[PDB]
Symmetry: D2
Subunit: 344 residues, 4 copies
């Protein structure tokens, strides 16, 4: 069919629409509840063998809105590619023990504070300057998809860390993905997405991709079909946004996605940083448009620094076939699967 | 079939292979020739109506290698998105009278100096504070695809500017595109590309896309077919690089594209900058992988600031259907067309 | 005396040493106490006339540690210059309703979340896309100046906002400045500093400088005298760090400051951004060394956009005498005063 | 007298004025002259012992304008801090065989091309994939200190490379420093500066500072005295710019420096990059104001990666006394000396 047929996993995206509904304001905030953190389990659990990497997800049913926390206890070297125009971010350290992704827009950054505080307690409040427990956080604005103003707070972040376990990730509406949505040319056509992950082991090489797509654009599959977002209930069709944009221009102008890619392959800070950018850009294949002024698109690239690539890039497949760029490209397909899991 | 069928123009990419051949090192440089600039006409000439924007292209047969210059006499606000890990850039100004694209790797930045010197002469050497004739230059490494070390020098850049005429662009092997090539997992599979352009007018809105793709990755069409690069002569097939990278890791790890988008729509510095990133990332659809450490990918987004978008984004197609993001997305498809013309 | 003599106001910095004491990187944390927020009054109250700008400061005696909040109810355009190698920053928005400075290293970023939560309550929980109350926060590591692990939390941040009043700032050991210290070539020579603010009105032009210096380097006055940090109790002398570093290299290699500048002068994003960098770099005069890999130096430049500079920069003092650069240089002196107040 | 007295070398700055005169445009350019390169010898030759680092400097009398080239044949890891708001840069590579500093504003970037083209010819046009000879260039606008439009062209950059010799730097009016000038609140008070260099060896540690100050601000010595720039011929006094700016505002608003630091101490890309920023910011001590919107301030930090620093930072002078921050501070003083040599 197309060039990527033989690496497509045939994810079974549900053709059924799930419009997010109209923007209804006046909803109750955090101070209207004795909020109870709930462990997020999603529609399905992904389980994977990546020692040292744990994941927790929690949500409030009041929202619904949640946080998803990637816990790497030992700490890991990190590059951040904040490429969107509306990025809400905390820390953005080049070394992290946890990455916290959350709804609630800028207010949801508080969840990450809950994680860092909890990690300090777990360190029993040791305060060496080279002993900081570092947490980077990113947020999506999910207030449009729901009639409540509840936001992931300190307690929910702490809960998410507490609910963290090795090698598991809740697919679908869970954690930060509870009220994520796509396709925002018009809110009438916006669909709920969710969060998604995917994992691959290549020999000893491990790659985990985590994504919470709350795009202005729509989610598309490797066949080039729009599978989530911009659904018109009148036509039953999901058109690529560019057709609405085209027509909007003819009429009126007459003459956020937060993600993480985690691997165990050793990369220098410059390799890791470019790796981050490559994989982030590859996501404009599965999300369109992407990296727009409206989006706060932020990808974290994390390495546990456990295995080395060969000193020379050579193989029987080519002289330049085993390096970071080859990895970022294998990783790009894992991330696309993760995006399709979120949109499934 | 796929979501972008209705905006695809059916560019007829030639199935016929054009491998670059193997790397032959030790050829003669500029010193070995009395180099005479040839005006580039390419396989075909695109003509477009965009007042104030001219293009010139020149090459040395002795390379073969060349330079392509976008000349906007009145000067135009510019944003630069230098994403790759191997960028060769000069100037990078937020306002430019010319953009110079050339082969010859870093040495070919000299062609842009030839343009700036020539423009200074034209201004009769005026050097007042606000009178700079600003030129931004970017290069590709095109020495692989030939057995000569001749690079675009000061003279060639000057020639390219002199050959510059309104509303024309030579498609294919012309200017900077004379020895551009794609698909470099192994040089045996590498194919010659070329340079390409496309133009679209929407009412008064104008969008020109110029591209010189010399990717590590390959060129792909909207159907998802690899149409240029990584051609295996033994199989007659162009596989997606990921399959080569995949097998290479199994075996060995057991357990540049320079482009410009030029429009006449008024955008603030922030909008133009984000517009550049969006359009640049969108190119990872037509080129894969893209923005890699091996690539010096650089896109210039240029506006002549001649027409306004409405103060509100609304239209019958949605409340957020007329803005810079909408424009960047219409522009993304013009650029894909340009990439296909280069790989045609 | 020196070029700046006529601009200096003879701030009376106390000659008396106040070494922080040997660091015990640890101690009782926030859970060991029932933390009671204390409105900070420091050693002295600075009173200024800048309508629209309020300041609150709070601390926990149990640290001691604290948070200082600048609250601009109407919101103001902001530029962030995060220059150090160990920055702890949340938000970093280009438009803020509050800036939150705090101790507690990264953990202290929680205080800023307390402010943003409060502000969302005050807005009775409206979450309109353009209704966000935005808060940017930065932190200093002040665990080395105390035998405690208490850090500014959500509650302390909220208190600081609550204690915020127009035109008042608590000089000295107050808010974020409670346990700030300077001069860390060795902790045995490290002195407590504090927080400081200065204010100047030029006609209608207003300039407020707020600073919390916790440098690796030392504070120095306009005469070039080290007046806080790197105090050697044996000699009674504060040497410039460079002499220690110099000696250290002969022997062993044989052959954070967070600040804000708030003004009412209209500046474009580009101008405000460059204004921020200029003022920030000017602080390497009063703090040496500065912008080091060990520091997380961050300056916020905030404008209430109320008065215009003339369209041309001319005056009797010169053709380039009235512009943003002129302002950033008037502002640089205000900020140096604030630094000296902090070290007083 | 002041904290730095003991590190000051008592550079004998000439008190005599050397006003640049006013900007007068319309003068003849390169086409009016049969330009021949002159090896710049300046007022005085600095000799230094730094194997592997050469310096060439050439100028055209007809400008007078020139280029200064730092040649490191073996190539060296580089970080670039381009702070200013009016930067003119070519290449900016993280690995360089030469750094080219020149007058002639953006047009002067052409001199760098002359270097690169000459290096290619030396390599005999070996275009090996990784045999690139990389040259990074920066420029100052010196067209305001002379009545000509002559700019450093390809031939002059070549000449500066060809005149390059080990361990020699021509102080004063030489190379890029021919028509550099300082203090530009008004052109009538602007003074010619020059270029400067200083060198220090600590054991086997070697630090070379090169600077071409063409500041909007004025050069100041360690005592805080204005020594070059803003000289009023009527008063015989050089005031600090802030006094002119301060008076300008009352009246009208009623109610580039390019430089390089070269060392042989091994630093990681992240260390080298922050080292660059620290040293660059330190220069606001000797140049005031600095890093302004009107300046294109660019500093290159280059390491030959020859000596290691200890694995721990400890010494008798303190726990944190031997590291890249310590080196960047030792380097800061070498750079200040070079600034004073330029203004001498
Ligand atoms: Na001539």
């Amino acid at each position: 069919v197309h060039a990527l047929t033989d690496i497509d996993g045939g994810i079974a995206v549900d053709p059924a629409p799930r419009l997010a509904g109209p923007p209804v304001f006046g909803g109750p905030g955090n101070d209207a509840f004795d909020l109870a953190p709930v462990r997020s389990t999603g529609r399905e659990m992904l389980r994977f063998d990546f020692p040292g990497v744990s994941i927790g997800a929690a949500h409030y049913e009041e929202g619904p809105t949640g946080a998803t926390v990637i816990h790497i206890p030992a700490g890991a070297r990190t590059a951040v590619d904040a490429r969107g125009g509306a990025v809400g971010l905390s820390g953005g350290y080049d070394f992290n023990h946890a990455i916290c992704l959350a709804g609630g827009a800028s207010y949801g950054l508080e969840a990450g504070a809950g994680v860092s505080g909890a990690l300090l307690e777990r360190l029993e409040y040791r305060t060496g300057f080279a002993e900081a427990q570092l947490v980077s956080s990113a947020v999506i604005y999910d207030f449009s998809a729901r009639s409540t103003a509840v936001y992931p707070d300190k307690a929910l972040g702490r809960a998410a860390l507490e609910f963290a376990v090795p090698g598991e990730f809740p697919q679908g509406r869970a954690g930060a993905g509870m009220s994520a949505s796509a396709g925002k040319v018009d809110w009438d056509r916006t669909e709920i997405t969710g969060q998604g992950a995917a994992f691959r082991r290549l020999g000893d090489v491990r790659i985990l991709a985590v994504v919470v797509p709350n795009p202005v654009g729509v989610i598309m599959d490797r066949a080039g079909t729009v599978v989530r977002g911009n659904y018109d209930a009148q036509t039953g069709v999901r058109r690529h946004p560019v057709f609405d944009y085209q027509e909007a221009f003819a009429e009126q102008v007459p003459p956020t996605t937060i993600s993480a890619i985690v691997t165990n392959v050793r990369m220098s800070p410059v390799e890791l940083n470019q790796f981050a950018k490559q994989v982030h850009s590859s996501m404009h294949r599965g999300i369109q448009p992407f990296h727009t002024d409206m989006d706060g698109d932020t990808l974290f690239a994390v390495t546990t620094d456990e295995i080395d690539l060969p000193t020379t890039p050579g193989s029987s497949r080519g002289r330049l076939s085993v390096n970071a760029t080859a990895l970022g490209a294998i990783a790009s397909e894992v991330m696309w699967d993760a995006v399709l899991e979120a949109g499934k």
